[PDB]
Amino acid sequence: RPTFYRQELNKTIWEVPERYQNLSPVGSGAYGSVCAAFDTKTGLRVAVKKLSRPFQSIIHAKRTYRELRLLKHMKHENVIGLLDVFTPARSLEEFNDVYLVTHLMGADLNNIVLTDDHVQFLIYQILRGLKYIHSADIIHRDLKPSNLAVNEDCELKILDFGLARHTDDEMTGYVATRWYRAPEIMLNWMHYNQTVDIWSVGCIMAELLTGRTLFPGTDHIDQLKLILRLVGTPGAELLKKISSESARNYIQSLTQMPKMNFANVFIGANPLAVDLLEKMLVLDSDKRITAAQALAHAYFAQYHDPDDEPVADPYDQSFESRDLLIDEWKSLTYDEVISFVPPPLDQ
Numbered sequence: 285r286p287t288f289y290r291q292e293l294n295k296t297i298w299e300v301p302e303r304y305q306n307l308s309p310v311g312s313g314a315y316g317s318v319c320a321a322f323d324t325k326t327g328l329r330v331a332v333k334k335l336s337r338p339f340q341s342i343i344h345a346k347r348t349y350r351e352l353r354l355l356k357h358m359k360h361e362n363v364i365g366l367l368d369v370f371t372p373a374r375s376l377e378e379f380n381d382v383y384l385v386t387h388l389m390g391a392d393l394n395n396i397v398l399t400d401d402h403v404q405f406l407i408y409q410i411l412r413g414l415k416y417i418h419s420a421d422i423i424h425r426d427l428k429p430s431n432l433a434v435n436e437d438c439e440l441k442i443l444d445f446g447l448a449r450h451t452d453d454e455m456t457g458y459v460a461t462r463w464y465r466a467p468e469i470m471l472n473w474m475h476y477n478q479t480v481d482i483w484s485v486g487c488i489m490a491e492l493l494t495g496r497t498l499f500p501g502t503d504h505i506d507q508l509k510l511i512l513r514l515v516g517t518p519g520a521e522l523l524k525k526i527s528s529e530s531a532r533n534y535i536q537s538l539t540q541m542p543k544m545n546f547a548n549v550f551i552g553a554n555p556l557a558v559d560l561l562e563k564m565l566v567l568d569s570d571k572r573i574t575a576a577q578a579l580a581h582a583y584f585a586q587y588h589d590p591d592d593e594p595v596a597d598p599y600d601q602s603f604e605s606r607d608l609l610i611d612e613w614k615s616l617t618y619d620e621v622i623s624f625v626p627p628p629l630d631q
């Protein structure tokens with residue numbers, strides 16, 4: 285067991301192993317504050333998130349367990365991984381604090397915004413990342429530029445997947461961003477699958493190509509209006525699939541937009557880039573390209589290697605459907621701290 289040391293970094297008492305040095309706060313991550321630090325053990329720059337009141341409620345408690353489970357499972361270049369997890373607690377009884385340590389990528393995709401080859405590389409890495417998380421039946425749900433971490437090599441990792449609530453029957457505290465959300469999760473108007481994340485990739489890729497937010501909607505309805513202006517009102521075959529009677533009512537009432545020519549919207553874009561965008565930004569949940577299929581699209585010829593696009597090990601999210609006391613979520617998280625083994629360090 286290591287020696288810890290305490291400091292006050294903006295409201296909060298950080299208590300961390302002596303191994304981590306020169307903590308300097310960089311803002312909020314998912315459910316708590318993040319410090320940049322220096323890892324004396326590895327010589328590396330790391331990010332330390334202190335979860336804010338991890339065990340105040342069932343929601344915080346379950347979400348704490350979820351995040352730690354998520355992180356401990358991901359092992360892939362384009363998906364953030366767990367370098368370390370720790371507590372100052374010396375027993376389960378006094379266990380009150382969780383700190384999660386990952387690599388510090390220099391930046392995220394806001395800060396960056398770009399040539400076509402740059403967009404190829406970055407979107408390529410996102411889809412390579414999504415294939416792996418999708419293959420474990422995990423869905424990001426709020427993929428967006430601020431949770432795409434990038435270093436100066438344009439090497440990219442996805443953060444914060446799997447947190448934004450599954451249905452509207454649950455609350456996880458996590459706040460999504462309107463502009464990158466698939467119309468089906470935003471509005472809950474047909475069922476949804478992993479391709480909610482492909483819609484997002486569509487929106488991010490477009491933005492990288494034009495500098496403009498694709499759909500800067502000011503609310504749910506304005507957002508839906510912006511979207512239909514580009515893709516057109518849904519056809520009779522799409523209407524067939526809308527499960528809600530109010531959504532279908534609303535749509536069939538809007539005065540009808542035609543689908544536009546994506547070439548006349550993405551003018552000056554590489555035509556392969558345009559073709560992919562048309563395959564990503566389709567209303568129909570069953571028709572939208574998947575991560576795997578997008579990886580094989582001509583746009584990515586320079587990057588695609590079927591033998592280096594791995595899938596994940598099976599991930600057991602049966603805990604998701606359980607209804608347990610705060611102390612039960614709490615002890616489960618404790619087990620997961622104690623059993624943590626850090627990634628191997630070669631020379």
Ligand SMILES: Cc1ccc(NC(=O)c2ccoc2)cc1-n1cnc2ccc(N3CCN(C)CC3)cc2c1=O
Pocket residue numbers: 310311312313314318331332333351354355364384385386387388389392433442443444445446447
């Ligand atoms: C350190 C850390 C620990 C855990 C998690 N959890 C997940 O990614 C995740 C995946 C599934 O569920 C949760 C993420 C992080 N993490 C890693 N690196 C970061 C780098 C920078 C920042 N900040 C960038 C600047 N911004 C103003 C505030 C956030 C933030 C971060 C940042 O939050």
